[PDB]
Each structure stands twice: as structure tokens, then as C-alpha cells.
């Protein structure tokens, strides 16, 4: 079991200058011929030549056109091809090989594979070695000359990186295409696509150089009409990188291709970005609203990698956050600018605080730059991506827009066309920090701890106000709990964006201020503060931390109503709910523990309910923001605050709180549901493929949120609203009608209606599957059995498997059924999936991440299932490593 260490990085004793590939696609096999023009590096110590090569069938291998003899000159163990040093030349040489691979049976979706009738590659991170032999690591930069041959009728469209230099006919109904890509690239960015693809195209003219760029978006014929939004998103991404960063696309063409079978969202292969169909295709008739924001973010993300990942490369896989964290940060800036809705930033914070905080307090906790790995694929995490994006975003908060843009340009100019590390990025930002602070002694050495220290910091406050002195003090403390990665945690450089609200009039008392907390504790004093303020802390969620505001609910209500910052208002509401949840949770738990015949529950704060009503009734307030305020915090956010969490007691606590609020606001919720109809469901632009209105989609989110609240409350005659909602032309509405009808006798009637509406579109059927999976049904186990038998069957499509099972794992009462039946069900699916797709089997482990945070009985049931999965003789290296780390073994 090999463990790779970050501190062990050493450049290779070899160089690969040129790759010349011939990929011959046939009915039952693909033949791959490859010539590597190689050299000996200055780091060479006369070692054996070792190539990565996984599952390759060797026809022949040669050095300088001399065939090598198996056993005497080379060994191959289905993982590593070792050429004994005595047979390796001492100067420039050619290594050649001919191997056979089988894309048709490649269900792992890594290397070269078949997705429906499209042949497609996936090389990141270690997939290139599944195509041909290589020193499969990102610092091995080479030029690529690639020829693809295939049956013309089955595969008329052939694509790879670089310029298409030749197209030729081959006897027997075959054809070929040659692509030459002269700029150096790592092998993970190589890609090839063959299929009967249809396209939409456009020309984009760059801002400064005025270069004409050809943009092509591809899919199978049936779904070509769903590519228009992706094309608009690509134009928007190009414009944003030019406008904000002054960055222009350098190539003559950019291809985007949608495939049905994909492990993740998309992949940034140079000039040939490949996408999960669910992250590229959409139509107003056949997609839910979420598809629009998803395509915008994913198209944006892969486009932004052209600089942060493609032009500026990674030295090694330990630097992953350098491309992933930075690109998620670029994607988030872009989406905030494109949507112009406060909910975009809130959605990012909601994701981090629920999912990433759970990971950071779990046995899987790691820094954004880990010190070791066994399985590289298990490094692609919410910590590396999302905490990494927040670490990248803190540089912008610290420096401000002007100096951040200066530091970013320094990073690009210094590292363009080269490999880079997290230190190179920090160095560039430090140069901008020195410029901003107007002193060359200033540094960001302490900032590096954000890359090496795991765990979420806790930031707590105490306040003081002297009315006579007009002097206000904010005492701040930071603390990170020790974990398995560091016995001793050090204080971080934490930027605290702050405001001071006058409680008398809700006005700002001070200008924009970012407190730079660099010690374990500090006291920040403010003079000429005329009245005791209410502090607005961590505006825009300025640091990825647990905020302990120490404010009363009266102060939190005033911020919720009057503060200027969307995050602080949202957070103040979150904190009020958390204080209520913890109180009622303890009250129900004590009643259950003591077997009480009667007991009391603390009611929901009446002034808090009044504030929710005030905000909901405000016609000038944001519909997206309103949907957050009426929703309780996520279960995965709540679990970070409760030890030995009893899921039944939490379900009872949530039910009580929602009923308490609904008993006062249902008539308001109903009135709003009806009044929002006209604007939310406006059909004016339904047949305009490019007209996307994020505010209108948020108005639909609010209506669908209110309808769910009203249906759960059994609001008088709400079933009439539900049935009418099922007739809407918008899938977000008609699929909502299915989910909310779970509380009524008409559920199966809507189940059949919505299935009929969804069945003829691959992606919409996956959305219908998700809706069914998350339906709050008492007969959910019987329903999942019906989906398996009638719809899912033996599908190996990751979108199908994930749609049926993952939404169900969010069902608090049912997935966590005390018998352990839900844990048993998901473990059976993990083990079955692991046989063909280890990466998807590991994704399916997601509900087990919080195992040691639940009540002792559920901890025991989850652990038993993970130990059963670990005992499987055929377990993959990926799943084994993941479960060993998760179970602290
Ligand atoms: Mg094979
Ligand atoms: Mg422009
Ligand atoms: Mg299918
Ligand atoms: Zn990425």
C-alpha cells in the first residue's frame, strides 16, 4: 500500500518532449500506437525506466525501433512497465509501444471509454496511463501529435486538442483525423472524442488582440437544441475573464462536448472541455431552474482553468487547491456578477458550512494542501475545492480589488507556461500586500498556515461600550480544535469585515473596515461611537470559520431587519434558529431519556416570527433571501453543534419549530404564494432560449418553498393549489407538485403524471428520480424498490444511480431508521457500484461521513455496515482507503 508524501517531491530522471499517438477505434477493441521522444534529465541517477500503464494489453514495445524482449529487458505487472536501466539509452531516444484497450467495457469512466454511442477520454488525474504508457504526473510537459481513426458512419466527428491538420479516408468505411498541439501540456489535459455529434457554433472576438475564436458546443443529435444556454455561458465566461482579469483566450477554437456517462460535472481538457450532460444541456420545457445556474457555473469553471490550471500548471497533485480552489473562487466571482442576486454568495456559504464543516470535523479532515495520499482521486474534496476557494477569496478581502488584481496579474505573468505551487501564489499576493501596506518588510508567511492547517477555526467575541467616552471595543478570540493532523494548532491570519449598526436608526456608523486578526486574541477599539452599536461581523462571510457572535436574539433580529450585509442578516437568522433548535432538541431528548408523561417546550421567539413576517411582506425585499429566512438551517450544519445526535429527536425539534412559525404565518405564506404567481411563472420569454432571469427563478424558489411549508402544515384546501401547480409548464413547479403531494392521497396520481412528462428526456428523468427519492413518504422503502425494478434496473450510469439514492439519504426520519435498513441499503449499493466504478462507489459513501456524530446506536449500525463493506474480498483501492480513513483504522 504505497503512500506518497508532499515533502518527497523530486523531478523525474527522464524527459518526454513529444507524444505521437495513433488511436485506432474498432468494434471490439481500440489499438493505441504511441511514440515518445524522450531524453535523460539532470536528475537521472541511472535508474530503471518506469512507465505507468494500467490494464494495457501489450502487443509490442520498442526503444529506437528495436523490439524489446519480455522478462529479459522489461517486466509489466498491469500497473508499471519497468525497462531495466542497462537497456535504457544515455541520450535522446524514442520509446514506442502498441497496446490494446477496450472502451466498450470501461465502466469506471476513466481512461478511454464509451458513453452511449460516444467514445470519450477522461485523464485527470491518473487516467492517461489507462490509454498508453507514460510517466503519468503533471510536471511531465510534452507536445502532442494525435491521429484518431474510426468507422465513418458510427463516428463522423473526431476531436482532440490543438489544430485539426489533416482529414483522410481509410479503406473499409473508415476515416481519420490528425490533430497537432504544439504548446507543452501535462498528460491529464489530453482528450479525444469520437461520435455522431451535432453542434451549435458562434464566433467570439477577443477584447484586446481582436482574435477571432470559433466556439463549438456538441451533443448527441436528440439533445442538440438544449445547447444554446451553454453557448451563451461560454461567451459570458470569456467576457468576464477579459473584463475582471484582463485575460483573453489564446487558441483559435474552444470545443465543449456533452456526454451521458461522467463521474463528475466537467473537465478542462485544453480546447476540448468535456461535460456531464447534466452540466451542459438545458431547455425551459425539459429542465428544472437549477440547471441554468449549474451550466453557468460549470461552463465558467472549466473556462477559467484555461489560465488557472492549463496555462499555469500544477507541479504535483499536492498543489490541487492551487487550480481547484482558485478556479472555484474565479467561478464564484463570475456567478455573483452574472446572477446579480445575493443568494449566489449565500448558496456558497450554505454549501461550505454544512458539507465542508462536517468534513473538517470528521475523521476525513485534511488541510487544503494535504501532506500525503494513497488514492489521488480521494483529494478531490469539498475542503480542497470550497475551503480552498474561501482561502483564495480571503486574499481579495485583505488586498481589496485593485491590489488583488495586481497580485493576480503578478501570479500569471511570472508563472504562465510553467508548473507552479501554492507558495508561488502566496508570493504573488505578498508582493501586492507589500505595495498595499507601503512597506517591503510586510509578509504573508503566517497566511501559509491556511494551506497546511486542518480544522475549522472558531472565532468568538466580547464587547464593551463606554457611553461617556463614546468608545467601543471588540475583543476577538480564535481557536482551532486539535485533530489527527496537528496536536498544536497555530493562530491564523483572519480578516474580519465589519460594520457597526446604530440600533436607533439602522444606519452605518463606520466606513468599510477589515479587522486583521493575526494573534490568538486581540482587542479592536473604535473612538467617536455616539451610541452603543450592534456589530455586523464577518460581512460577506469574510473567513471560513465558526462565528460565535455572542449577540442577544433582540440584536440578531435588528441585524436581520436593518443590516446592509446579506450574509450577516442570513447569519443572524441562522443563529436565532440554532439557539432555538439546541434548546428544543435538549427538551425533547430529556423527555425521551426520562420517559416523561408530560413536559414543556420553549416556544419560538415571537419578535423573531414578527421580523420574518415584516421581511416577507416587504415588496422591495429579495425573493431568494426570503426563501432562506423561512427555512431552518441544513441538518448537516446542525450536526456540528450537537454531540451524539439523535436523528429522531432532531426531526421532532424541526417539526415543532416549523409548526410554531406556520401557526402564526401560514395565511401570510398563502397570500404570498398566490400574489407571486404572475411574476414567478411569467411565460413571456419561455420560447427565448437565451433569456435567463435569476430573479424570476428565485421567485419560483420562494413559491415552491412556501407551497412545501403549506402542504406539510395541511393548510386548508392546499391540495387544489398542488393539482394546479402540476399543470405548470416549468419542471421546477411540476416536480415540486409531485414532492409536496407526498402528504396527500393524490401522490401516486402525480407520480404517474410527472413520470410521463419526464420519461422522454434522459436528464429530466434523472430529475424525476431525484424528486421521488427525496419525497417525504412513509412507504419510501417500497417506492425505492419500485424505482429499482421499473426505472433504474442494472444501469451503470452515475447520474441514474446517484439520482435514485443520494436524495433519499437526506431523509432524516427514514434514511436513519433505527433498524439500520437505510444504512444496509446504501452499503449494498456502494458494494455493487464498487465492482465497476470505484469513484462513484466512494461518492455514494457520503451519508456515512457523519457516522461518529450520531447517537450511540446509529454510530454502531453505520460502523457495522462500513466494516461489512471493508470485508468485501473484491473491494477497490479507492473504497478501501476511504473507509479505512473514515473508520479511523
Ligand atoms: Mg485492459
Ligand atoms: Mg466585452
Ligand atoms: Mg441512459
Ligand atoms: Zn476544476
Amino acid at each position: 500500500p504505497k503512500i506518497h508524501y508532499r515533502k518527497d517531491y523530486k523531478p523525474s530522471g527522464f524527459i518526454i518532449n513529444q507524444v505521437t499517438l495513433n488511436i485506432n477505434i474498432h468494434d471490439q477493441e481500440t489499438i493505441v500506437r504511441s511514440v515518445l521522444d524522450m531524453d535523460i534529465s539532470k536528475h537521472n541517477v541511472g535508474e530503471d525506466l518506469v512507465f505507468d500503464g494500467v490494464g494495457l494489453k501489450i502487443n509490442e514495445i520498442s526503444i529506437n525501433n528495436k523490439k524489446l524482449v519480455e522478462g529479459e529487458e522489461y517486466t509489466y505487472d498491469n500497473e508499471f512497465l519497468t525497462i531495466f536501466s542497462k537497456f535504457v539509452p544515455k541520450s535522446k531516444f524514442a520509446f514506442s509501444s502498441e497496446v490494446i484497450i477496450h472502451p466498450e467495457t470501461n465502466y469506471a469512466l476513466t481512461g478511454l471509454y464509451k458513453s452511449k454511442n460516444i467514445i470519450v477520454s477522461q485523464c485527470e488525474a491518473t487516467g492517461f496511463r489507462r490509454i498508453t504508457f507514460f510517466i503519468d504526473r503533471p510536471d511531465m510537459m510534452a507536445k502532442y501529435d494525435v491521429t484518431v481513426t474510426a468507422d465513418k458512419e458510427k463516428y463522423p466527428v473526431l476531436l482532440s486538442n490543438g489544430d485539426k491538420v489533416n482529414e483522410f479516408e481509410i479503406p473499409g468505411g473508415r476515416h481519420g483525423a490528425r490533430f497537432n498541439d504544439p504548446p507543452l501540456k501535462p498528460c491529464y489535459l489530453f482528450a479525444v472524442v469520437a461520435g455522431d455529434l451535432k453542434h451549435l457554433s458562434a464566433t467570439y472576438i477577443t477584447k484586446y488582440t481582436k482574435k477571432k475564436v470559433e466556439l463549438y458546443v456538441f451533443s448527441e443529435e436528440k439533445y442538440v437544441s438544449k445547447l444554446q444556454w451553454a453557448l451563451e455561458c461560454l461567451k459570458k465566461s470569456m467576457a468576464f475573464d477579459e473584463d475582471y482579469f484582463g485575460l483573453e483566450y489564446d487558441l483559435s477554437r474552444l470545443n465543449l462536448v456533452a456526454v451521458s456517462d461522467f463521474n463528475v460535472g466537467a473537465m478542462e481538457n485544453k480546447g476540448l472541455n468535456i461535460f456531464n450532460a447534466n452540466s451542459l444541456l438545458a431547455s425551459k420545457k425539459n429542465s428544472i431552474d437549477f440547471s441554468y445556474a449549474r451550466i453557468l457555473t460549470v461552463v465558467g469553471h472549466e473556462y477559467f482553468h484555461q489560465y488557472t490550471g492549463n496555462r499555469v500548471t500544477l507541479r504535483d497533485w499536492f498543489q490541487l487547491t492551487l487550480k481547484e480552489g482558485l478556479t472555484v473562487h474565479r467561478e464564484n466571482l463570475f456567478s455573483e456578477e452574472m446572477t446579480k442576486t445575493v443568494t449566489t454568495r449565500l448558496s456558497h456559504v450554505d454549501l461550505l458550512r454544512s458539507v465542508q464543516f462536517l468534513e473538517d470535523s470528521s475523521p476525513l479532515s485534511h488541510p487544503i494542501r494535504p501532506e500525503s495520499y494513497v488514492s489521488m482521486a480521494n483529494f478531490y474534496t469539498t475542503t480542497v475545492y470550497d475551503k480552498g476557494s474561501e482561502v483564495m477569496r480571503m486574499y481579495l478581502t485583505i488586498l481589496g480589488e485593485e491590489y488583488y488584481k495586481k497580485g493576480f496579474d503578478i501570479y500569471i505573468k511570472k508563472n504562465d507556461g510553467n508548473t507552479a505551487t501554492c507558495e508561488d501564489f502566496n508570493y504573488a499576493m505578498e508582493q501586492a500586500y507589500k505595495m498595499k501596506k507601503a512597506d517591503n518588510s510586510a509578509n504573508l508567511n503566517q497566511y501559509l498556515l491556511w494551506f497546511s492547517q486542518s480544522g475549522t477555526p472558531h472565532v468568538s467575541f466580547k464587547y464593551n461600550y463606554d457611553a461617556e467616552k463614546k468608545q467601543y471595543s471588540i475583543h476577538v478570540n480564535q481557536y482551532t480544535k486539535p485533530d489527527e493532523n496537528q496536536k498544536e494548532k497555530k493562530p491564523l491570519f483572519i480578516p474580519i469585515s465589519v460594520g457597526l449598526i446604530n440600533p436607533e436608526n439602522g444606519k452605518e456608523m463606520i466606513s468599510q473596515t477589515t479587522l486583521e486578526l493575526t494573534k490568538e486574541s486581540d482587542t479592536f477599539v473604535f473612538n467617536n461611537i455616539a451610541v452603543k452599536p450592534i456589530p455586523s461581523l464577518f460581512r460577506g462571510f469574510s473567513a471560513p470559520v465558526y462565528i460565535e457572535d455572542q449577540l442577544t436574539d433582540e440584536e440578531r433580529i435588528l441585524l436581520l431587519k436593518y443590516d446592509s450585509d446579506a450574509f450577516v442578516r442570513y447569519n443572524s437568522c441562522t443563529n436565532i434558529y440554532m439557539k432555538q433548535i439546541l434548546m428544543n432538541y435538549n427538551e425533547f431528548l430529556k423527555a425521551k431519556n426520562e420517559k416523561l408523561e408530560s413536559f414543556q417546550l420553549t416556544p419560538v421567539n415571537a419578535q423573531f416570527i414578527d421580523a420574518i413576517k415584516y421581511l416577507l411582506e416587504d415588496p422591495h425585499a429579495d425573493a431568494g433571501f426570503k426563501s432562506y429566512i423561512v427555512s431552518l438551517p441544513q441538518d448537516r450544519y446542525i450536526i456540528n453543534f450537537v454531540s451524539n445526535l439523535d436523528t429522531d429527536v432532531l426531526a421532532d425539534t424541526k417539526e415543532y419549530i416549523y409548526k410554531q412559525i406556520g401557526d402564526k404565518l401560514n395565511d401570510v405564506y398563502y397570500k404570498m404564494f398566490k400574489s407571486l404567481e404572475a411574476k414567478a411563472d411569467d411565460l413571456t420569454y419561455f420560447n427565448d432560449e437565451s433569456h435567463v432571469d435569476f430573479d424570476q427563478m428565485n421567485m419560483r424558489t420562494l413559491r415552491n418553498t412556501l407551497l412545501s411549508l403549506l402542504s406539510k402544515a395541511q393548510y386548508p384546501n392546499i391540495l387544489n393549489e398542488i393539482i394546479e401547480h402540476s399543470k405548470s409548464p416549468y419542471p421546477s413547479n411540476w416536480l415540486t407538485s409531485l414532492s409536496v403531494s407526498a402528504y396527500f392521497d393524490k401522490y401516486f396520481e402525480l407520480y404517474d403524471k410527472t413520470y410521463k412528462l419526464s420519461k422522454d428526456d434522459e436528464l429530466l428523468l434523472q430529475e424525476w428520480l431525484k424528486t421521488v427519492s427525496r419525497s417525504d413518504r412513509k412507504d419510501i422503502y417500497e417506492i425505492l424498490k419500485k424505482l429499482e425494478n421499473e426505472v433504474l434496473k442494472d444501469s451503470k450510469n452515475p447520474n441514474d444511480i446517484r439520482a435514485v439514492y443520494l436524495p433519499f439519504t437526506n431523509n432524516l426520519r427514514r434514511f436513519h431508521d433505527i433498524s439500520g435498513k437505510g444504512y444496509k441499503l446504501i452499503a449494498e449499493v456502494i458494494t455493487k457500484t464498487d465492482k465497476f466504478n470505484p469513484m462513484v462507489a466512494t461518492q455514494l459513501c457520503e451519508p456515512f461521513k457523519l457516522w461518529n456524530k450520531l447517537d450511540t446506536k446509529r454510530q454502531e449500525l453505520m460502523l457495522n455496515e462500513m466494516n461489512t463493506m471493508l470485508q468485501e474480498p473484491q473491494i477497490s483501492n479507492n473504497l478501501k482507503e476511504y473507509l479505512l480513513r473514515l473508520t479511523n483504522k
Side-chain angles (χ1 to χ4, degrees), residues 1-6 8-9 11-26 28-32 34-56 58-68 70-71 73-103 105-152 154-213 215-284 286-401 403-412 414-467 469-486 489-503 505-553 555-619 621-777 779-781 783-784 786-793 795-823 825-834 836-852 854-870 872-879 881-888:
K2 212 207 182 290
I3 309 162
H4 300 89
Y5 294 96
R6 184 176 71 88
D8 287 344
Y9 176 82
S12 171
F14 302 99
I15 309 159
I16 299 156
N17 291 141
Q18 177 81 55
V19 183
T20 302
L21 294 180
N22 279 262
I23 299 160
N24 308 125
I25 300 160
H26 298 272
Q28 279 204 282
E29 57 177 25
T30 289
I31 295 142
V32 181
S34 182
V35 173
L36 304 183
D37 290 307
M38 292 183 65
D39 205 352
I40 298 301
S41 85
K42 59 187 164 179
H43 306 102
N44 188 279
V45 292
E47 62 268 42
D48 289 334
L49 173 50
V50 188
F51 291 108
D52 297 299
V54 174
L56 309 183
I58 299 170
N59 275 350
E60 59 178 273
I61 71 157
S62 301
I63 283 175
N64 299 326
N65 296 328
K66 180 190 152 68
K67 199 181 208 285
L68 302 187
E70 196 280 313
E73 304 177 317
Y74 78 90
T75 59
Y76 181 52
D77 69 355
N78 210 48
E79 197 178 358
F80 304 112
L81 170 57
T82 303
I83 300 151
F84 311 122
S85 59
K86 67 186 276 190
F87 302 110
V88 181
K90 301 192 184 183
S91 67
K92 288 161 113 85
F93 68 96
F95 171 79
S96 65
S97 70
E98 180 182 277
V99 306
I100 306 175
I101 61 176
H102 303 87
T105 60
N106 186 0
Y107 311 119
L109 325 185
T110 189
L112 193 67
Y113 68 97
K114 200 171 188 274
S115 172
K116 204 178 296 189
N117 297 317
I118 300 162
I119 294 285
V120 59
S121 61
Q122 175 53 46
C123 298
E124 196 184 3
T126 64
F128 190 75
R129 70 187 66 177
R130 293 179 182 241
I131 302 177
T132 192
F133 297 107
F134 211 74
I135 299 177
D136 187 9
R137 39 187 281 184
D139 61 336
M140 299 301 293
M141 306 286 273
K143 302 160 77 164
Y144 285 70
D145 188 323
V146 187
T147 299
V148 191
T149 82
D151 180 84
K152 196 175 162 69
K154 285 195 195 74
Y155 304 108
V157 177
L158 305 173
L159 297 164
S160 193
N161 320 89
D163 304 283
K164 187 163 62 171
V165 298
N166 197 32
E167 295 182 281
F168 53 98
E169 299 288 290
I170 304 158
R174 293 177 69 83
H175 77 140
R178 184 183 183 185
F179 298 84
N180 196 28
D181 191 17
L184 296 177
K185 70 167 170 297
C187 66
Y188 82 88
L189 293 176
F190 160 84
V192 60
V193 182
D196 182 17
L197 305 172
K198 303 295 172 187
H199 66 273
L200 297 182
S201 63
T203 300
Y204 187 90
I205 302 164
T206 70
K207 192 165 181 179
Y208 302 109
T209 64
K210 315 283 178 189
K211 178 192 245 288
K212 263 189 169 71
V213 184
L215 312 180
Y216 282 80
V217 295
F218 294 93
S219 79
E220 62 174 290
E221 182 179 340
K222 187 179 195 261
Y223 305 120
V224 75
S225 67
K226 298 174 72 177
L227 284 164
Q228 191 57 47
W229 178 233
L231 194 49
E232 301 301 342
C233 289
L234 186 56
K235 296 184 245 185
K236 290 170 164 75
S237 302
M238 297 178 76
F240 185 73
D241 231 0
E242 287 178 337
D243 298 346
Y244 195 96
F245 295 103
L247 302 174
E248 299 167 285
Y249 191 69
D250 52 323
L251 314 171
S252 60
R253 189 158 147 171
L254 180 46
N255 302 292
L256 312 188
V257 177
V259 297
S260 292
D261 305 86
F262 209 72
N263 291 337
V264 297
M267 181 55 219
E268 72 274 22
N269 324 109
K270 277 178 99 174
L272 182 51
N273 299 350
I274 295 161
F275 294 77
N276 184 315
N278 75 17
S279 299
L280 200 72
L281 315 170
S283 71
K284 265 93 178 269
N286 292 316
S287 306
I288 61 163
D289 291 350
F290 181 70
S291 280
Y292 284 86
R294 175 72 182 165
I295 292 157
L296 177 77
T297 67
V298 180
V299 171
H301 182 105
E302 309 319 332
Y303 180 72
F304 301 137
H305 270 309
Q306 183 62 0
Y307 274 87
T308 57
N310 301 357
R311 282 175 67 152
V312 179
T313 295
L314 299 185
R315 186 190 74 172
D316 61 76
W317 294 115
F318 295 97
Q319 313 313 315
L320 188 62
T321 202
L322 180 62
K323 84 175 172 84
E324 295 306 339
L326 182 56
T327 303
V328 171
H329 165 53
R330 286 152 51 63
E331 170 207 332
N332 294 164
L333 286 175
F334 167 65
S335 288
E336 286 177 46
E337 184 59 34
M338 294 302 103
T339 62
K340 293 283 180 188
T341 57
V342 299
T343 61
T344 301
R345 174 63 184 153
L346 298 184
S347 73
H348 304 156
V349 171
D350 210 290
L351 165 71
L352 190 90
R353 303 205 302 182
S354 57
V355 176
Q356 199 277 328
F357 280 11
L358 186 165
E359 182 167 87
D360 234 342
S361 65
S362 83
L364 298 166
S365 179
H366 54 280
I368 63 160
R369 182 162 69 173
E371 296 300 339
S372 68
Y373 71 84
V374 172
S375 175
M376 182 41 214
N378 294 340
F379 248 40
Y380 289 79
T381 60
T382 184
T383 294
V384 168
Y385 276 64
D386 307 307
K387 177 174 170 172
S389 69
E390 294 299 300
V391 172
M392 290 300 180
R393 185 185 183 273
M394 277 188 290
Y395 288 118
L396 170 59
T397 299
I398 289 160
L399 298 167
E401 202 174 281
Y403 288 97
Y404 174 77
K405 282 174 183 175
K406 287 187 176 183
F408 189 97
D409 207 43
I410 287 167
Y411 171 71
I412 302 296
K414 206 154 179 162
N415 306 280
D416 194 10
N418 292 93
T419 56
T421 68
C422 297
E423 282 89 353
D424 295 321
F425 195 82
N426 199 60
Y427 177 89
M429 294 293 124
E430 185 174 280
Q431 299 328 108
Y433 191 65
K434 288 181 190 289
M435 287 176 191
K436 192 208 167 81
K437 293 269 107 157
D439 70 291
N440 271 58
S441 59
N443 66 74
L444 290 182
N445 194 63
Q446 183 188 13
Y447 201 89
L448 292 166
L449 295 169
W450 281 118
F451 290 89
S452 62
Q453 185 164 288
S454 59
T456 311
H458 295 74
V459 183
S460 57
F461 298 90
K462 277 166 186 288
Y463 318 98
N464 183 71
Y465 181 69
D466 193 292
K469 283 176 175 73
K470 314 293 186 229
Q471 191 176 75
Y472 185 67
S473 308
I474 301 169
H475 176 73
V476 194
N477 181 81
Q478 70 165 292
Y479 162 75
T480 297
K481 294 175 177 184
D483 59 22
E484 318 316 319
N485 306 306
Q486 282 98 28
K489 297 287 181 185
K490 285 184 172 76
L492 303 162
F493 188 146
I494 305 174
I496 315 170
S497 305
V498 297
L500 298 176
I501 297 303
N502 179 332
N505 63 8
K507 300 260 252 290
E508 302 292 322
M509 298 181 76
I510 63 165
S511 294
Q512 183 195 263
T513 302
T514 295
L515 307 178
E516 288 176 3
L517 174 68
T518 60
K519 300 190 286 188
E520 178 177 86
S521 73
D522 213 342
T523 293
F524 298 93
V525 187
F526 300 89
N527 282 326
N528 310 308
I529 304 304
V531 74
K532 190 190 173 181
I534 300 169
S536 178
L537 304 162
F538 286 102
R539 292 190 160 175
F541 188 63
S542 73
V545 301
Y546 282 110
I547 301 155
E548 300 163 1
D549 73 14
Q550 308 277 17
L551 297 178
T552 70
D553 284 349
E555 293 171 317
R556 295 168 169 159
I557 292 154
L558 203 143
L559 287 176
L560 173 56
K561 292 177 67 175
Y562 306 112
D563 198 4
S564 57
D565 187 74
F567 172 69
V568 182
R569 294 178 75 201
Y570 161 83
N571 203 38
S572 291
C573 182
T574 297
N575 296 339
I576 289 160
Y577 279 135
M578 281 312 300
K579 178 177 181 277
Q580 188 69 29
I581 293 161
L582 296 179
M583 219 192 292
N584 295 150
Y585 177 92
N586 193 51
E587 286 167 346
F588 276 120
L589 178 63
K590 211 161 185 282
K592 186 191 183 144
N593 283 346
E594 294 176 24
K595 286 185 160 73
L596 297 180
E597 283 304 320
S598 66
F599 62 101
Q600 285 148 264
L601 291 164
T602 301
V604 170
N605 179 304
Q607 290 72 53
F608 174 51
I609 296 165
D610 273 339
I612 298 166
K613 187 180 176 281
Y614 172 91
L615 295 188
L616 294 176
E617 286 181 342
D618 178 10
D622 187 82
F625 180 79
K626 288 178 191 194
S627 71
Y628 277 103
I629 76 168
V630 299
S631 309
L632 262 66
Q634 294 264 298
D635 295 339
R636 288 176 293 182
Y637 176 71
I638 299 164
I639 199 153
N640 290 302
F641 305 94
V642 183
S643 304
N644 306 322
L645 184 110
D646 184 321
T647 53
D648 287 311
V649 176
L650 177 60
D652 286 354
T653 300
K654 288 165 50 175
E655 189 179 271
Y656 172 72
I657 293 160
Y658 276 122
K659 187 83 191 304
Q660 277 270 304
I661 303 168
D663 280 352
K664 286 193 180 181
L665 305 187
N666 282 343
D667 288 351
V668 175
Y669 291 171
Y670 182 73
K671 185 175 190 184
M672 284 174 70
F673 176 78
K674 300 303 286 182
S675 71
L676 284 156
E677 186 175 352
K679 290 180 180 171
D681 298 342
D682 178 34
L683 296 170
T684 305
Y685 300 105
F686 194 82
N687 287 133
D688 190 316
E689 296 171 350
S690 296
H691 184 99
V692 179
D693 184 337
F694 288 96
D695 293 328
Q696 186 188 3
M697 295 195 286
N698 275 347
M699 293 177 185
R700 288 203 286 270
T701 292
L702 180 54
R703 280 194 91 225
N704 287 323
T705 296
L706 297 179
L707 187 57
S708 176
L709 294 170
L710 292 161
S711 305
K712 172 71 183 164
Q714 301 283 281
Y715 189 80
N717 306 125
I718 203 66
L719 189 54
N720 294 155
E721 267 74 32
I722 299 171
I723 296 311
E724 285 312 292
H725 212 62
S726 76
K727 296 167 185 174
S728 178
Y730 290 105
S732 286
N733 296 334
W734 61 254
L735 283 173
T736 293
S737 78
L738 171 58
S739 63
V740 309
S741 81
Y743 308 108
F744 296 93
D745 69 303
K746 290 200 179 290
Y747 180 75
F748 285 121
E749 179 183 298
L750 292 189
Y751 177 107
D752 290 342
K753 176 181 173 71
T754 63
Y755 172 75
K756 275 157 185 174
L757 288 171
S758 307
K759 77 179 167 67
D760 302 307
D761 181 297
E762 174 175 287
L763 297 179
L764 187 60
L765 184 51
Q766 292 163 4
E767 291 309 333
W768 179 81
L769 283 177
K770 288 180 177 188
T771 308
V772 173
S773 183
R774 65 161 141 269
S775 291
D776 190 11
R777 288 296 290 187
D779 57 344
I780 193 64
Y781 284 91
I783 287 160
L784 297 172
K786 186 178 160 67
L787 292 187
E788 287 164 349
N789 295 341
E790 297 175 0
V791 183
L792 181 59
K793 302 178 197 284
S795 174
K796 290 183 206 288
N797 183 322
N799 291 357
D800 290 337
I801 301 158
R802 293 183 293 234
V804 169
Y805 299 108
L806 292 172
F808 158 70
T809 72
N810 294 137
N811 184 324
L812 195 67
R813 288 208 189 273
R814 306 277 124 78
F815 169 65
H816 296 284
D817 185 276
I818 202 66
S819 66
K821 66 197 281 184
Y823 310 152
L825 172 62
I826 305 307
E828 281 170 5
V829 175
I830 294 155
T831 292
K832 186 191 181 204
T833 306
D834 196 53
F836 63 88
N837 193 330
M839 294 178 219
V840 175
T842 306
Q843 292 170 348
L844 293 161
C845 284
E846 167 106 322
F848 291 103
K849 290 176 90 190
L850 50 59
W851 77 272
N852 65 345
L854 302 175
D855 58 84
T856 60
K857 188 80 241 283
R858 291 183 173 90
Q859 282 193 41
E860 183 186 295
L861 297 159
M862 278 200 163
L863 182 53
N864 170 74
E865 291 304 334
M866 293 186 281
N867 286 326
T868 296
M869 287 193 284
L870 274 168
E872 286 293 340
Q874 309 305 314
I875 192 170
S876 69
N877 296 333
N878 279 270
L879 182 65
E881 187 242 39
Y882 198 78
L883 299 168
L884 284 178
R885 294 197 292 118
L886 186 51
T887 65
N888 274 323

